[PDB]
């Protein structure tokens, strides 16, 4: 359950409902 | 105007560019240059198509006059040595702005004809 910038919900597959990420930068809420 | 055509209305100012040049149109140009003893009067010369010229500093075109050995050359209009022009034939058609031919093929039914 480790998130890059923020912290909380995570999954080594899809983005996250908080700001979205993986390594990119885009994706907003 | 923009910084490209804002500094071009001075030299060779856009003096009411005579309707024609236009296709087959052959407006007898003018002149006032010296080259020799500065006392040269008017002059005359037949033209044709092969139009040319842009926005700011536009030029006449390929005179293509039959008289004499042949033709060529031309002074951009307007110019330090410019003056009003007149009319001629009543237009025609083909494609004015670029029209070769007429050269290397100038005869009766050939010239003054597309």
């Amino acid at each position: 359950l480790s998130v890059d910038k923020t912290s909380g919900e995570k999954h080594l597959r899809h983005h996250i409902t908080a700001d979205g990420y993986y390594r990119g930068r885009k994706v907003i809420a | 105007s923009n910084i490209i055509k804002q500094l071009e209305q001075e030299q060779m100012k856009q003096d009411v560019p005579s309707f024609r040049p236009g296709d087959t149109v052959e407006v007898k140009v003018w002149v006032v240059e010296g080259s020799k003893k500065r006392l040269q009067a008017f002059e005359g010369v037949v033209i044709a198509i092969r139009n040319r010229g842009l926005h700011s500093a536009f030029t006449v075109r390929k005179i293509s006059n039959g008289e004499g050995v042949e033709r060529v050359f031309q002074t951009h209009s307007p110019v330090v040595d410019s003056i009003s022009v007149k009319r001629r034939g009543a237009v025609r058609k083909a494609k004015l702005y670029y029209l070769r031919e007429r050269t290397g093929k100038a005869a009766r039914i050939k010239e003054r004809l597309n």
Binding site: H15, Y21, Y22, R23, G24, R25, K26, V27, I28 | -
Partner: protein, 114 residues
């Protein structure tokens, strides 16, 4: 070299091609996934395509089924997704790039239609 023109990732043919298709994908399904040069140029395959196809008529619907070979998502572009973008100029269907996926390392967003 010279200025920045188009981008032929492969050759000439492989480069109209490709644009079509993966263009009708953003009208059949509001979700597409290519690469980096991805649909950045497909953002063009769509609008052009929208507009000149905005208002329903004869001199528009044809331009539609000319770039996109399909009857299913050529009529839906009308009566749907317009009139649905009425008082809205531009911003047709943009998208924010997404992190690269497995296999061939290449970041890709998801076109989508807003």
């Amino acid at each position: 070299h010279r200025k920045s023109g188009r981008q032929l990732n492969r050759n000439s043919s492989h480069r109209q091609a490709m644009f079509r298709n993966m263009a009708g994908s953003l009208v059949r399904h509001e979700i597409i996934k290519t690469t980096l040069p991805k649909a950045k140029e497909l953002r063009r395959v769509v609008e052009p395509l929208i507009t000149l196809a905005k208002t329903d008529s004869v001199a528009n619907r044809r331009l539609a089924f000319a770039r996109t070979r399909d009857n299913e998502i050529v009529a839906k572009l009308f009566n749907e997704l317009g009139p649905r973008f009425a008082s809205r100029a531009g911003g047709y269907t943009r998208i924010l790039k997404c992190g690269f996926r497995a296999g061939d390392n290449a970041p890709m967003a998801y076109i989508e239609l807003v």
